[PDB]
Design goal:
Protein name (chains A, B): Sensor histidine kinase VxrA
Number of strands of chain A: 7
Largest interface: A-B, 40 and 40 residues
Radius of gyration of chain A: 22 Å
Distance between the termini of chain A: 36 Å
Helix content of chain A: 25-40%
Order of helices and strands of chain A: HEHHHHHHHHEEEHEEE
Oligomer: homodimer
Number of helices of chain A: 10
Organism (chains A, B): Vibrio cholerae serotype O1 (strain ATCC 39315 / El Tor Inaba N16961)
Bound molecules: magnesium ion
Shape of chain A: elongated
Subcellular location (chains A, B): Cell inner membrane
Subunit structure (chains A, B): Homodimer.
PDB class: signaling protein
Strand content of chain A: 5-15%
């Protein structure tokens, strides 16, 4: 009966009332309000695949002592400008962050680090901070849903997947808009289409018992 | 990298110390203490695929009034014997339950129903009751693990799967023995083998986003 599976999934998608959705988000509005750099969890980690570890260490020591060895590689120019500015105490306008690569080599953003030293500029620099650096958003808002997405849900959203689950919500793409439905509606329409489903924490290539296995990429 | 997946799963299995397992259960001991009929969730439902619905209804009415229409089909002979005995008040020895098909046509077991009318015989009839009809077992015992298994975990155990997950435990089959490990050990050995995994609520034939889809059989 697994041969009719694609047809049943199409029937499943067609059962939803897209005008009675919980909320809906245009993909364009999501890309305007959140650069991909500010969604992906890897932006919160030290940028070990972009800078040598010794260069990241040399930046932290420079930010601590505000004197001494400057890092070498010419890809540290902008992070050096940022670090020297905090040490010299000179100001960086919100337009400087809008111009930057946003992500600091030690993980997180320039804006969040700058707002930790100058908390009066927090609100104006919020658009340049990672979602995981911003305060807990109000329930039902786009930021709230994004902050509560695991890496797999974020990756599915960034890649524009036709559908993905995130917690207690189903995200369904119709055209260039995502429609959210609660899991009760998800399960009801899966029942009617003759479907069962599972939410994955990775891809599934080999199943043993009730365990889906996958190689991790890194 | 998905081509090396079977080799990585074999390495994963080989990393476990089977002598330092949480607990272990011989498959033979499980089959001795629990007939499959007393594990599968479908035994708790009315036996609609074995008896006509009208015959099940005729049995409930007979058990209520203790008079009137006897069901027809000759597959109801033993359930009729059981029902007439409760009505006549005659006793059924534990050996009668050991001889029976265990499962009552309305779902559940003969033994549990009999022990509801004669609670003094509960302990002697416990071996003939469904695991979901028995009291909550003590933690760490075989019955405890079985009572907390979803249908998918039960089906994997009944079918003798090489491995399956159930809650916070990994069940690993080596020979004819199942070895239990906590999920921390599961994840540590998956990390070292270069693997990611997900626990399924059904099979996975088509993946959309982070959702594994499957047709339900019924
Ligand atoms: Mg993968
Ligand atoms: Mg299946």
């Amino acid at each position: 009966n697994a041969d009719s599976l694609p047809e049943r999934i199409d029937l499943f998608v067609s059962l939803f009332d897209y005008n009675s959705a919980t909320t809906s988000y245009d993909i364009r509005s999501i890309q305007t309000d959140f650069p991909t750099r500010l969604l992906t969890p890897d932006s919160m980690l030290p940028q070990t695949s972009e800078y040598p570890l010794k260069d990241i260490q040399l930046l932290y020591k420079l930010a601590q002592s505000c004197t001494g060895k400057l890092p070498l590689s010419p890809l540290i120019t902008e992070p050096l400008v940022f670090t020297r500015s905090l040490c010299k105490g000179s100001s960086l306008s919100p337009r400087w962050f809008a111009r930057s690569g946003l992500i600091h080599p030690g993980g997180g953003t320039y804006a969040f680090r700058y707002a930790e030293k100058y908390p009066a500029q927090f609100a104006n620099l919020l658009p340049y901070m990672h979602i995981q650096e911003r305060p807990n958003a109000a329930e039902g808002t786009l930021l709230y849903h994004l902050q509560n997405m695991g890496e797999d849900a974020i990756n599915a959203l960034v890649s524009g997947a036709s559908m993905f689950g995130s917690g207690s919500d189903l995200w369904l793409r119709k055209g260039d808009i995502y429609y959210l439905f609660n899991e009760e509606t998800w399960l009801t329409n899966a029942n009617k289409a003759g479907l069962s489903y599972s939410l994955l924490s990775a891809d599934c290539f080999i199943q043993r018992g009730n365990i889906c296995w996958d190689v991790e990429d890194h």
